[PDB]
Design a binder for this molecule. Structure first.
Ligand code: F3S
Ligand code: F3S
Ligand code: F3S
Lengths: 322, 45, 63
């Protein structure tokens, strides 16, 4: 299975995260799983005209392209020319058009590629967009109706960056005959990773249940949930970040950092407008503006009051102790 | 005039003070109505 | 207000001097309760008057 991994408006964080892959690690994925990595800007040996030969052979159908991985945004500026992202003699968006049209499967890795991500933040100088989404709005660069040659839409492996498993396990599934096991949600994300929430497996959910808030960073995060004071988007964000830990170690929320909802197409949420960074926007100083997914403010607040009343003593004390 | 008669209450100090206080905690009204809308659209659930 | 309700419930959490263990009841239907109540009513005016004689019997059993 040939893989061509291109980077548009990328920071290469998805590649670096991918390189952190374990079980399989990246080398075993590239070699031992029958995935022929034709080229990758961070890893491909070919430069210049040899690299362009590889790209053109993929684009024109001279050689098969099974998986086109795209990382980074599709940069369309200036004026829709895409010349703020010139790659191998073309605007990167033209490469995207050709290769997405050539690939059996197109995988957008990372929010930039999936939805536009950080570069698509206003004022979006690069005219960045995702492959098939611009933020939540379906269509992105390739259009809502784009399908790869295997009939799939762009497989969106979101995250900023995506966790290595979010792509590697998909690649293994494709390589092991389990492509049919891959189900995609409405954002084209693999449901095997994105039916759960970041909160799922968060070490602070018991504090969340009892509405015990982390009050401060550092040692303050030895207790409490980050939802109330730090804008944790865990309960509104689909991800397996607390199921499949980052770097096989931790997750933002475990570590005391609020989930920024990076697997969600709106990321960065509120465009990091003043007062929204590591803060919970609240109505009347006590009602969160955004409640967990599938809850309403009325029920959520009633249950929150009940939980605060029922909260056991340990939920009010440090638990992630030295 | 009826509409100018309410426009007069708009420049009435005590009426203005109360309306400006309603515009102060407008967020809370918005959130309670949003909470009610949420509860209604989850009334089947 | 939630902390006030927590401290209030936490006070009611301290409780003393109340025993409620494994209460059970059945087979009163098999008992002729209606007949026994009729018997008791026929006997109640006798039992109340006989209370000094019943005490004098019990006193001789307390030795
Ligand atoms: S990791 Fe980098 S490539 Fe985009 S998805 Fe995040 S800015
Ligand atoms: S339970 Fe965890 S995912 Fe965030 S909302 Fe609380 S720190
Ligand atoms: S910011 Fe992203 S990496 Fe996971 S903890 Fe939140 S979905």
């Amino acid at each position: 299975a040939s893989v061509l991994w291109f980077q548009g408006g990328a920071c290469s964080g998805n590649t670096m995260s991918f390189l952190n892959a374990d079980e399989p690690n990246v080398v075993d994925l590239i070699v031992d799983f029958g995935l022929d990595l034709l080229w990758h800007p961070s890893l491909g040996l070919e430069l210049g005209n040899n690299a362009q030969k590889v790209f053109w052979d993929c684009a024109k159908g001279e050689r098969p392209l099974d998986i086109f991985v795209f990382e980074g945004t599709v940069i369309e500026a200036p004026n829709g020319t895409g010349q703020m992202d010139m790659f191998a003699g073309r605007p990167m968006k033209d490469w995207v058009t050709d290769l997405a049209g050539a690939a059996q499967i197109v995988v957008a890795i990372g929010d930039c590629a999936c939805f536009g991500g950080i570069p698509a933040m206003e004022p979006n100088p690069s005219g960045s967009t995702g492959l098939q989404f611009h933020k939540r709005e379906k269509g992105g660069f390739l259009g809502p109706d784009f399908r790869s040659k295997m009939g799939l839409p762009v497989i969106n492996v979101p995250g900023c960056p995506a966790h290595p498993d979010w792509i590697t396990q998909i690649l293994v599934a494709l390589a092991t005959g389990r492509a049919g096991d891959i189900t995609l949600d409405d954002l084209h994300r693999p449901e095997t990773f994105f039916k759960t929430f970041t909160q799922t497996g968060c070490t602070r959910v018991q504090f969340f249940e009892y509405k015990q808030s982390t009050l401060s960073f550092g040692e303050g995060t030895r207790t409490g949930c980050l939802f109330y004071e730090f804008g944790c988007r865990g309960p509104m964000t689909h991800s397996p970040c607390n199921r499949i830990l980052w770097n096989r170690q931790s997750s933002k929320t475990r570590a005391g950092m609020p989930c920024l909802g990076c697997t969600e197409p709106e990321f960065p949420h509120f465009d990091l407008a003043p007062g929204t960074v590591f803060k919970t926007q609240k109505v009347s100083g006590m009602i969160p503006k955004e409640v967990p997914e599938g809850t309403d403010h009325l029920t959520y607040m009633g249950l929150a009051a009940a939980a605060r009343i029922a909260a056991p003593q340990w939920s009010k004390e440090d638990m992630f102790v030295v | 005039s009826p509409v100018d008669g309410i426009r007069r209450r708009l420049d009435d100090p005590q009426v203005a003070e109360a309306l400006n206080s309603l515009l102060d905690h407008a967020d809370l009204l918005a959130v309670l109505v949003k909470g009610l809308d949420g509860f209604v659209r989850r009334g089947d659930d | 207000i939630a902390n006030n309700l927590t401290s209030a419930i936490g006070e009611l959490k301290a409780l003393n001097a109340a025993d409620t263990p494994i209460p059970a009841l059945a087979a009163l239907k098999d008992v002729d309760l209606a007949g026994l109540a009729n018997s008791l009513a026929t006997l109640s005016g006798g039992l109340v008057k006989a209370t000094p004689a019943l005490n004098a019997v019990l006193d001789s059993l307390t030795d």
